[model samples]
Target: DLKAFSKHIYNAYLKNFNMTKKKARSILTSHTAPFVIHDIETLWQAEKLPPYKEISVHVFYRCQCTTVETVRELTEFAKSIPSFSSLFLNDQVTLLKYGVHEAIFAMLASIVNKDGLLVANGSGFVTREFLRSLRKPFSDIIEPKFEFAVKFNALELDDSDLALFIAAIILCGDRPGLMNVPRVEAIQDTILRALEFHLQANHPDAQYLFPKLLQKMADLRQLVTEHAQMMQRIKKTETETSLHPLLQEIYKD
Candidate 1:
């Protein structure tokens, strides 16, 4: 087959992954869809889209167009919907990826904006190598002693960039003093409720800020009620079925 992917990312995997070439090829075709689905699924988390799970599936369904007119027509419909206004980019990135085959990977990387665009952590979050490159950025960003806007951007809160976030924040939202406040998982439940409301809302456009602003005010109210350091609960919900995740339930103390 033609090398549709970069040699660097594939060569090592091809050599050592626990599959024969044909088997690996079959698995790759099946598994690659999940990666793309998750990438877009988690992306909806940050934008605060309505009925995210349902709407996401709808948008993905509309992704069949492979031309300019398709993008314009679909983008128009999305903007018209109260639920989808300003929800995502038009097929801008899709067009680029399909039209230019050579720069596909680079284009994918570029769609991830460096400014607060990405969820705090995701598969496409800044790569490990990029983190290492910021070794000196610690003085301005990571040092705990000083507070600087430069430092604030270093460690962001994507809320649900998948479970890496819940994996990271399970115990951090707790306080030794506060008794009535929602605990880690309870706090998560509240956010899920908010999303559910948004999903069911009729004036999704009129109530544009209803969900996000409700979250912000609730966060502020929680902080004012108690003087402990409470990080904003992760805004994204992962799976509806997985009660409190084991990483959070068992590992949280």
Candidate 2:
């Protein structure tokens, strides 16, 4: 039965993803004093700003570091999927290359809300207004994610649901350069079915939650595309900020 299949997927999820929504939410709501970055003017007045460009570059660099870590976790998660490991190495890399950003953004929502996002392992909160006050390209990169995260949070999906949803994102069949489209598609179909079933049981009173999640997946694609475009602009204009080698490889045409 698919119940057994779904349970296996949940086990894989628990084994791979270290940060669950439950853990993240607890940290975000904890009473511990978190470093809060409020706005650019306040930092400038407090003599914390090195220079505008340097601060922006530092912020972007931190984002790249976090993204790289997420990619590693995602790679492990994908490998844990039995069918994913069966793919040729090149195809596995291809799937991860295309899907990691989408997956990262989706998971990011779990740590974000309307006000800000948890950073430095949930020991800090960077306000949305603060992110918006940065220089052009840097300021531009974060707000959309906040927008998406706010709406996505409304779905009230738990870690188990996200575990299945992230798997579905990575196993997507439509990515270019996939060597075995049918196999990837088959895996994605199973993940999607499992997610739909998981949602019904978990959010029993939440009508059409599955379809809403599917739409959020679509929204994540668009969000990533816009993010990539901004990254390209940053590459062109912000030469001092280095993109991670793995991120550059993924973003490369």
Candidate 3:
């Protein structure tokens, strides 16, 4: 069985968007480092990341960051430091929500297991959104609202797992799915379970969050399954697909 921490890392990768090798490198060597694994393999499998287009989504009310102009210069100056530059938007929140070790727990919550469902890290999203507003968007910054798709069946277990799973999807061109988005959507139960377990887990010193997680998992079974079906419909209508010779090998289709 994977250590609780390993399980946690899997969760963080699941929901993160904008994952890239460049940001990944920043995480590995930073003093704040957690996972030593180089995520290059995942990157190799995913499709090459396309440039992101800015959408007109409404910003959360208190979501001002360095970009507010007043603090912009100060934030930039702070970012210039070696490790300080590595701070992710999600990092800022989780760091505060749980301190250093607990923040790592949040990171673990973001993993993507071999199954394709995305997991949620239990960081306060509003705070992370606050950080996001500070500067230009980059791949390394993690957000609470994010959802990542898994290419490999087992790779996407939690939110953070999605980071690398997405890496594979991008480098390998797993761009969504066609008539069988439901096929991919079927993993939602697993995703929810992973997410619930992730949140229930706290700092190492905290009491056994596992039992609480287990209870939540049992309660969420029906709900998560329902979510899976809903996802199938969402995938059928919302997601698009492209033909890739490699996918046939992965899915055995």
Between candidates 1 and 2, the one scoring higher on TM-score is 2
Candidate 3: residue 172 Cα off by (Å): 31
Worst 10 residues of 2 by lDDT: 43-52
Which residue pairs come into collision in candidate 1?
120-158, 141-151, 159-234
Q: List candidate 2 stretches off by more than 4 Å.
A: 39-53
Identify the leading candidate in terms of lDDT.
2
Number of the top TM-score candidate:
2
> In model 3, where do residues sit more than 4 Å from their true spots?
1-108, 112-205, 219-223, 239-253
lDDT digits (tens) for residues 1-253 of candidate 2: 5577677877787877767788788877765755677755543433241233567776777688778989998998888878899988988999899889999989989989778887756766778877887788889788888889989988998887888899999998999999889999998998898888888998999989998899999998888888889888888987777677889899995
After superposition on all CA atoms, what RMSD does each candidate show versus the true structure? 23.1, 3.1, 18.6
Decreasing lDDT order of the candidates:
2, 3, 1
Query: What TM-score would you give candidate 3 relative to the actual structure?
Result: 0.23
* Distance from true location, Cα of 161 in model 2, Å: 0.1
Winner of 1 and 3 under lDDT: 3
lDDT of 3 by residue, 1-253 (tens): 1234335434333223333223333343343423221133322232121122222111211112211221222233223322322444443222222121112222223332222112111111122233344323321123321232122111223334332222112111112333333322333333344444444442344354444433423333333334334434433543332212221122221
lDDT for model 3 comes to: 0.28
